[PDB]
Each structure stands twice: as C-alpha cells, then as structure tokens.
Structure 1
Amino acid sequence: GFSDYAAAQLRQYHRLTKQIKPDMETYERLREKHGEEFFPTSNSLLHGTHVPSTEEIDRMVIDLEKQIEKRDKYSRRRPYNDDADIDYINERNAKFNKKAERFYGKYTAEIKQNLERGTAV
C-alpha cells in the first residue's frame, strides 16, 4: 500500500539509482585534476565552481524526461464497459458512485441483493 509520499520516493530512487552506470574515465580524470579536494568535507571550498559540459546536461535532461514519462504513467485507466447497469447521469457522478462502491460497498451488500431479487427480504 501507499502509506507515505516518502516510501514511493525511496522506491523510485532505488529504481533510478540501480539503473545508472558510472563512467570511470571521467571519474579518474576529474580525480586526477582535482587532487586533494576530490574527497571534500561539508565545508571545503568547491561550492560555486563546477561547470558541467553539454554531454552531462544532455544525459540529465534525457533521464529526467524518462522520469517524467514514468510519473505520467502512474494512474492507468481501467477499461470502460457499458454492459453494467449504469446508475449515473453525469461524468462526475460515475466516479462518485465508484467511490461509494469503494467505501460503503462492504456494508451495503444485503440491500443490493434485496433490490435485485425484487425489493424483498
């Protein structure tokens, strides 16, 4: 179940962070260029220095577009059958009756049987 906005974030982060692959060439290049400060503390100096080249920002933009697509596929539309006896006259009435069947559907299980058998019992 859902239970939190942070647990779905954590699941989504584990997915993205397992999908990524690091490049050791760029890593060792920047390590050899930066030297002493490549293992920084909270307070070293480099906060206002990095300028990423075009390939890095292109990779970030493509990854973020894929992430936006994965987010937009979150609520899949359930298929609409017209064989069920419809009990709504609007477009919002159908979804409100669906919410009523979600919440009160466990309790109001005898009266629907009474209705379908002819208002008896």
Structure 2
Amino acid sequence: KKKRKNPDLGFSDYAAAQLRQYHRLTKQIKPDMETYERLREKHGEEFFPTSNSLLHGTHVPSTEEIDRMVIDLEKQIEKRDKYSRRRPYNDDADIDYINERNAKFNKKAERFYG
C-alpha cells in the first residue's frame, strides 16, 4: 500500500501552479509499450534524435488518438473553469455597499485596513 500528500501554498508564480498541474496530468498518463514497439520496429535509429540530428517530415496521427488529447483538453478546461470558488450570497451580515462592485471594493478595503 501507498501514501503521500501535497499541500497547497501561495500561487507564487503562475509557473508554480502550471507545474503542479503538469505533475498531476503527467502522473495520470499510462502508455502502451505495444504501440511503442510497433512504431519502433518501423523506424529504429530515427527514434533517438538529438535536437539537431534527425528528420522525418511529419508523423500523421490516427484520429482515435486525436480524440484522446481533445478529451483531456475538455477535462483540463473544466478543472480550470473552477479556479475561483465563489462564496454564497449571504445577506445575513450588515449591508453598507450600494452595488456588487462597491461590495467587493469594501471587501478589499477590509483586507488592507485592520
């Protein structure tokens, strides 16, 4: 059995959050060594190109593949859509604001003047 934890911190740079998300997505993927070997026995030495070494024009993908990336796109898009968790419209406390822009400005002022 296995165990780990990862706590959230400051967004410090957009890079940090991006990196966390990449970690998760990367861990998810599971590759088929079948297709890997199939692709391998055709091309051989072309498999291991340096930045500058080797070249074959284009690798054309079966559509079924393309569907995988499209699906992952939609998933990540949703997960990103949920970035900001909204606090429910609570009327219970005292109202001094005149509109929602004013309500939010009063909230930002509450953070900076204690």
Give the unaligned 5+ runs of structure 1. Answer: 106-121
Q: For 1:96-121, what per-residue CA distance to the aligned partner results, in whole angstroms no more than 9, with x for missing partners? A: 1111111213xxxxxxxxxxxxxxxx
Aligned mates of 1:47, 1:59 — CA distance in 2: 24
Q: CA deviation at 1:91?
A: 1.6
Aligned mates of 2:56, 2:92 — CA distance in 1: 63
Map 1:59-74 to 2 at 5 A: 59-74=68-83
Higher mean displacement: 39-48 or 17-26: 39-48
User: How many pairs align?
Assistant: 105
Whether 2:43 is the aligned partner of 1:50: answer no
After TM superposition, the score normalised by the length of structure 1 is: 0.82
Change (3 A) 1:90 1:23: same
Displaced runs of 4 or more, over 2 A:
44-48
Q: For 1:43-73, what per-residue CA distance to the aligned partner results, in whole angstroms no more than 9, with x for missing partners? A: 2333631111111110000001101011101
Aligned mates of 1:4, 1:47 — CA distance in 2: 38
After TM superposition, the score normalised by the length of structure 2 is: 0.86
Give the unaligned 5+ runs of structure 2. Answer: 1-9
Change (3 A) 1:67 1:32: same
Q: CA deviation at 1:83?
A: 1.1
Map 1:15-26 to 2 at 5 A: 15-26=24-35
Aligned mates of 1:72, 1:50 — CA distance in 2: 32
Q: For 1:16-58, what per-residue CA distance to the aligned partner results, in whole angstroms no more than 9, with x for missing partners? A: 0001111111111101111111111112333631111111110
Percent identity for Structure 1 against Structure 2:
100
Contact kept in structure 2, 1:88 and 1:94, CA below 8 Å: yes
Aligned mates of 1:47, 1:72 — CA distance in 2: 38
